[PDB]
From Swiss-Prot, chain A:
Function field: Component of the general transcription and DNA repair factor IIH (TFIIH) core complex, which is involved in general and transcription-coupled nucleotide excision repair (NER) of damaged DNA and, when complexed to TFIIK, in RNA transcription by RNA polymerase II. In NER, TFIIH acts by opening DNA around the lesion to allow the excision of the damaged oligonucleotide and its replacement by a new DNA fragment. In transcription, TFIIH has an essential role in transcription initiation.
Species annotation: Saccharomyces cerevisiae (strain ATCC 204508 / S288c) (Baker's yeast)
Protein name (record): General transcription and DNA repair factor IIH subunit TFB5
InterPro entries hit by this protein: TFB5-like_sf, TFIIH_TTDA/Tfb5
Subunit details: Component of the 7-subunit TFIIH core complex composed of XPB/SSL2, XPD/RAD3, SSL1, TFB1, TFB2, TFB4 and TFB5, which is active in NER. The core complex associates with the 3-subunit CTD-kinase module TFIIK composed of CCL1, KIN28 and TFB3 to form the 10-subunit holoenzyme (holo-TFIIH) active in transcription. An additionnal subunit, TFB6, plays a role in the dissociation of the SSL2 helicase from TFIIH after transcription initiation. Interacts with TFB2.
From Swiss-Prot, chain B:
InterPro entries, per the entry: Tfb2_C, TFIIH_p52/Tfb2
Keywords: DNA damage, DNA excision, DNA repair, Nucleus, Transcription, Transcription regulation
Species whose genome carries this gene: Saccharomyces cerevisiae (strain ATCC 204508 / S288c)
Miscellaneous comment as given in the Swiss-Prot or TrEMBL entry: Present with 8900 molecules/cell in log phase SD medium.
Descriptive protein name: General transcription and DNA repair factor IIH subunit TFB2
From Swiss-Prot, chain C:
Residue stretches making up the Helicase C-terminal domain: 430-584
Miscellaneous comment: Present with 825 molecules/cell in log phase SD medium.
Protein name: General transcription and DNA repair factor IIH helicase/translocase subunit XPB/SSL2
Cofactors named for this entry: Mg(2+)
Record: residues binding ATP: L227, P228, C229, G230, A231, G232, K233, T234
Subunit structure: Component of the 7-subunit TFIIH core complex composed of XPB/SSL2, XPD/RAD3, SSL1, TFB1, TFB2, TFB4 and TFB5, which is active in NER. The core complex associates with the 3-subunit CTD-kinase module TFIIK composed of CCL1, KIN28 and TFB3 to form the 10-subunit holoenzyme (holo-TFIIH) active in transcription. An additionnal subunit, TFB6, plays a role in the dissociation of the SSL2 helicase from TFIIH after transcription initiation. Interacts directly with TFB6.
Length: 66, 445, 608
């Protein structure tokens, strides 16, 4: 008896652990986890964690070339 | 697919409107130029003997080597309502469209042309210094407007409405600016007559009465016209769209006379070289092409350095590459521009090594990239590192009873084009919100 | 701007950069030169007439930014202008030649840059009158400018001889540069060391040009020469000593290497070891001939804090003897604290600093302006590669996909211990297992470099193969290298930060790396110099292989790309290896078991 609305993104183990980091540096946003290719996130903060994903790979590479 | 898009629009146009379009010799000549060599051969074979032929005679004449293109020609010929295939006396009597037939006959014989070649005034002026230069000026202004650099001479208001309403150069008024869509980078990548066809296709798509056959016929005689002469100012709708395309820079009009520039011939047909760009593992640009337009279109995705008379130089940066990717420009669009701007030395060396490796093996234990990938695959691995994800947001179910029901519901969603994701191992799939109600109704039934 | 030049609509991003205001001459076809008015960055066309003749003066007056296949990039600098006017090439002849080979009218900013690059050459000269720096001038005219400066303390005077190093910098800012051009033949007081060579040795033309660099006048011009690895730089230095023919010593901060240059020296030269001597950590016995050699090490001068009296007597003896010329090998480490004291201690009438790479972690390479002088000669890597004078090498980068568990532990790890944690991914073990299988199937000699000596021992012990690190007994080390070189059955070696240098191994042909310092461009290039001297370099079908196992999704991406960009600047791009063929075709993959991955993570956790 469980069928609840959520945003399911096909993902990777690495970006899954990045989403858990998002939870670490600001908690209780992302809701539950199914596997490495299925996580469930707050549908209000999908774009918040999308732009946080953007600054995450910005911190990962940062590609200066100046 | 340009002639294919024209033929598709003509087949969307209903049969009697098409037959109205087949009335006049200039329109029939333009359609005679559109049709394939086989269909052209069929109509010129038929036009001088008025005998309805069975299809079996055509089958006897046709050698089966060109049978596929024969079927394409007769399928377009039938679907354009230009053929009359009826199985009278059991066998398929074939007939060309008679209005098309008589108008082609009058065009070939020089008979009744009704000035569909053009309502002439024949008060010719020089076209090299007036018509070509005015056309180059106005087309330069709209080209830099489509680049994005500021320029004083903006386009007209109706073509500004074309860019606003159409998905081509989305004038995002929330930002207040015209913006480059992916469709419009495709527009930029298009050929010159391809761009003209796209402009008229959008303009005819949104224009309504402005009679449709007036638009059709007037455009076909506009393509049929020649250069540098004065002509009579025709219908009213044709006259006001004539003044409209005068504001487009296409005709030099002295407010009844008008002087059609080189662009009418450009619409009729097309026309270490220019645009041959030396690729570099150093990612430095030695273009064999210089124009203010060239610098204007290359600045969108290249850090540039300086301009010389043929070699404008610069450097590809990954910031410029990501700038292009954030502009909505496809990596396929960027690399497609790179094959349009390939260079002869690297092309010769790639052909020699292509023959050398195909002498050895087709596989070669490496991915396939014929152009030198040290410029290309560094960008293309970063372009593989451009999107590399996929996101589903909305309704999602799980843990089905049987795999057959899973495949049935998922396959049904794929058939109606509302399936976004599936996974056979997890027996889960995602569908769009628009398709939710239809999938639920199918699930109940 | 000597033009009206209404700007392009997109010339705003040409921020003082649209240089089309200056006209194109009709001689743009034959001439190759375009001139930057502000930056001075200089454009050279490779497929243009007389570019080969003009490129010599392009190196002489300008520095080369880059020399790719089609369009070379140069840049005028005051350093190379000083080198050109020290050779002797007057301003109006230089201006006439460059405008005669310039497609465009020359910018007066660059012209007056050349005019302001006019020095008092031949006007200040220090002479070492038997370990006594007498700073002469050619005229009393120099003295009136020089007395305006007051840092100090025909006409010479007292200077603190250590302070000569700093007042050389000081006279570089007040623009009266001293020159060091030894009149050894007019210095009859120092005993000459007349030693020749054999006719069987063959001097290559770039080495001949390098010998012509300090011998434009015959006086020994002191300076810098940097050449690629394995270019016979020892033989060039031996030739330079054999034409200088005076008392001379050789220095380098190592031991095994210093004794093998002693061997190489006394091999090809006609000088007997009677004139030679050696002073290092082990043995401290000198020759007593009036002229000869003490080939030695920085070790014996960099430490005087705790030395034996045997050491003390030898450093007293070599300080007492005044030498003529000195050789500074691997000069990229000398400008540190105890290391450039060798320049202050040793007084020789001519200097030369030598290294494989003139790059380091900072701009203490600019101290050579006031340490060892200008740069005399350099060779080109692509030129010697395509001429077969050095190797033609395929360079590859191997991205190891970072596994999930080591990734999440890497993210919860502290910053400087993150390095080992990303290195300990088992996917790296699997990939290098298949690669060593494929290249020993190819029969290649494979070399692994790691900064962590423990991680290098981990990889070597997992492979069941010998280990080479910084602090092992020497007899075990010579046993391993004897087995590898002499024994054909031993072929694969795991090297480290003492094995990248101090040994001479041209046999290396396939190189892999897994770890280094943050910005060790220089140490990375010293690692790559081992396979630069691969002597199988003239036959077709030869392509030496370089690999680098980098763990993905890390800032090791940034670190590796920042370190490897120096080699790209040398002209060595790295091909893509991300998905490879045969990852599954090898039947065994090292810690392919997820429980084995967990146990390896448990081991690195227990150490952590
Ligand atoms: Mg080497």
């Amino acid at each position: 008896a469980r069928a609840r609305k959520g945003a399911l993104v096909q993902c990777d183990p690495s970006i899954k652990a990045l989403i858990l980091q998002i939870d670490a540096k600001m908690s209780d946003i992302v809701l539950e986890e199914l596997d490495d290719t299925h996580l469930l996130v707050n549908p209000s903060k999908v774009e918040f964690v999308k732009h946080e994903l953007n600054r995450l790979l910005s911190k990962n590479i940062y590609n200066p070339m100046d | 697919s340009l002639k294919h898009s024209v033929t598709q629009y003509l087949e969307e146009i209903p049969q009697q409107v098409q037959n109205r379009l087949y009335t006049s010799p200039a329109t029939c000549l333009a359609i005679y130029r559109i049709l394939p060599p086989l269909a052209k051969f069929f109509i010129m074979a038929m036009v001088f003997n008025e005998n309805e032929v069975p299809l079996l005679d055509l089958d006897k004449w046709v050698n089966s080597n060109g049978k596929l293109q024969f079927q394409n020609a007769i399928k377009s010929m039938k679907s354009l309502h230009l053929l009359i295939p009826n199985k009278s006396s059991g066998t398929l009597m074939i007939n060309l469209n008679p209005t098309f037939k008589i108008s082609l006959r009058n065009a070939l014989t020089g008979g009744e042309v009704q000035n569909s070649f053009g309502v002439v005034v024949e008060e010719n002026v020089v076209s090299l210094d007036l018509l070509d230069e005015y056309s180059a000026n106005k087309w330069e202004t709209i080209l830099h407007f489509m680049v994005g650099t500021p320029l004083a001479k903006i386009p007209s208001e109706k073509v500004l409405n074309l860019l606003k309403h159409s998905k081509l150069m989305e004038e995002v008024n929330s930002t207040g600016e015209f913006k480059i869509t992916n469709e419009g980078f495709q527009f930029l990548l298009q050929e010159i007559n391809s761009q003209l066809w796209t402009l008229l296709l959008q303009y005819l798509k949104m224009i309504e009465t402005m009679d449709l056959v007036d638009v059709l016929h007037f455009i076909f005689m506009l393509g049929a016209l020649e250069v540098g002469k004065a002509y009579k100012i025709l219908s009213e709708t044709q006259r006001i769209m004539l003044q409209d395309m005068r504001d487009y820079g296409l005709v030099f009009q002295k407010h009844s006379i008008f002087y059609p520039t080189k662009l009418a011939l450009m619409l009729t047909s097309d026309t270490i070289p220019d645009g041959s760009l030396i690729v570099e593992t150093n990612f430095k640009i030695y273009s064999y092409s210089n124009s203010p337009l060239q610098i204007a279109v290359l600045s969108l995705f290249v850090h540039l350095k300086a301009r010389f008379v043929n070699m404008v130089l610069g450097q590809i940066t990954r910031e410029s590459i990501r700038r292009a990717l954030t502009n909505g420009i496809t990596a396929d669009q960027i690399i497609a521009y790179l094959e349009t701007h390939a260079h002869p030395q690297m092309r010769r060396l790639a052909e020699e090594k292509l023959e050398k490796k195909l002498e050895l093996d087709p596989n070669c234990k490496e991915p396939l990239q014929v152009l030198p990938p040290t410029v290309v695959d560094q960008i293309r691995l970063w372009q593989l590192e451009l999107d590399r994800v996929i996101t589903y947001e909305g309704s999602l179910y799980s843990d089905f009873e049987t795999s057959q029901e899973y495949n049935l519901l998922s396959k049904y969603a794929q058939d109606i084009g509302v399936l976004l994701w599936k996974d056979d191992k997890k027996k889960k799939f995602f569908i769009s919100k628009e398709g939710n109600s239809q999938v639920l109704d199918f699930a109940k039934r | 701007i000597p033009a009206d030049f209404v700007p392009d609509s997109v010339s705003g991003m040409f921020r003082s950069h649209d240089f089309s205001y200056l006209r194109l001459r009709p001689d743009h076809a034959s001439r190759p030169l375009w001139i930057s008015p502000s930056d001075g960055r200089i454009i050279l066309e490779s497929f243009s007439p007389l570019a080969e003749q003009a490129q010599d003066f392009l190196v002489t007056i300008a520095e080369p930014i880059s020399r790719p296949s089609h369009i070379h990039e140069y840049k005028i600098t005051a350093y190379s202008l000083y080198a050109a006017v020290s050779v002797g090439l007057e301003t109006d002849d230089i201006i006439s030649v460059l405008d005669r080979l310039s497609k465009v009218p020359v910018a007066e900013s660059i012209i007056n840059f050349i005019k302001g690059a006019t020095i008092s050459y031949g006007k200040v000269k220090l002479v070492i009158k038997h370990n006594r720096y007498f700073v002469e001038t050619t005229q009393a005219d120099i003295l009136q400018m020089l007395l305006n400066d007051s840092v100090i303390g025909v006409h010479s005077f007292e200077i603190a001889n250590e302070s000569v190093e700093v007042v050389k910098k000081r006279c570089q800012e007040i623009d009266y540069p001293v020159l060091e051009e030894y009149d050894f033949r007019n210095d009859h007081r120092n005993p000459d060391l007349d030693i020749d060579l054999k006719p069987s040795t063959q001097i290559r033309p770039y080495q001949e040009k390098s010998l012509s660099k300090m011998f434009g006048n015959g006086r020994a011009r002191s300076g810098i020469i940097v050449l690629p690895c394995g270019a016979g730089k020892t033989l060039v230095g031996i030739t330079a000593a054999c034409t200088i023919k005076k008392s001379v010593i050789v220095l380098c901060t190592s031991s095994v290497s210093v004794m093998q240059w002693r061997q190489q020296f006394l091999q090809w030269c006609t000088l007997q070891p009677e004139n030679c001597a050696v002073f290092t950590s082990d043995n401290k016995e000198m020759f007593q001939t009036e002229s000869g050699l003490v080939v030695s090490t920085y070790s014996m001068v960099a430490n005087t804090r705790n030395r034996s009296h045997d050491s003390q007597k030898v450093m007293d003896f070599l300080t007492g003897r005044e030498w003529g010329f000195i050789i500074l090998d691997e000069v990229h480490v000398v400008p540190a604290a105890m290391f450039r004291r060798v320049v202050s201690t040793i007084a020789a009438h001519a200097k030369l600093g030598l290294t494989a790479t003139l790059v380091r972690e900072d701009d203490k390479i600019g101290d050579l302006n006031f340490l060892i002088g200008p740069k005399l000669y350099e060779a080109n890597w692509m030129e010697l590669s395509q001429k077969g004078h050095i190797a033609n090498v395929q360079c590859a980068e191997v991205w190891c996909p970072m596994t999930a568990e080591f990734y999440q532990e890497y993210l919860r790890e502290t910053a400087r211990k993150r390095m080992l944690l990303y290195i300990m991914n088992p996917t790296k073990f699997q990939a290098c297992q298949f690669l060593i299988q494929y290249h020993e199937r190819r029969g290649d000699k494979i070399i692994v470099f790691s900064d962590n000596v423990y991680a290098l021992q981990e990889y070597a012990l997992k492979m069941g193969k010998p280990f080479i690190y910084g602090s092992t007994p020497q007899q075990e080390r010579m046993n391993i290298l004897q087995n590898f070189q002499y024994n054909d059955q031993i072929n694969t070696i795991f090297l480290s930060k003492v094995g990248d240098t101090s040994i001479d191994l041209p046999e290396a042909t396939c190189l892999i790396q897994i770890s280094s310092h943050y910005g060790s461009r220089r140490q990375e290039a010293q690692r790559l110099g081992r396979i630069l001297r691969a002597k199988r370099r003239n036959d077709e079908g030869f392509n030496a292989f370089f690999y680098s196992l980098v763990s993905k999704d890390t800032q090791e991406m940034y670190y590796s790309t920042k370190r490897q960009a120096f080699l790209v600047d040398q002209g060595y791009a790295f091909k893509v290896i991300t998905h490879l063929h045969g990852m599954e075709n090898i039947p065994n993959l090292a810690y392919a078991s997820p429980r084995e991955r967990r146990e390896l993570l448990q081991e690195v956790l227990l150490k952590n």
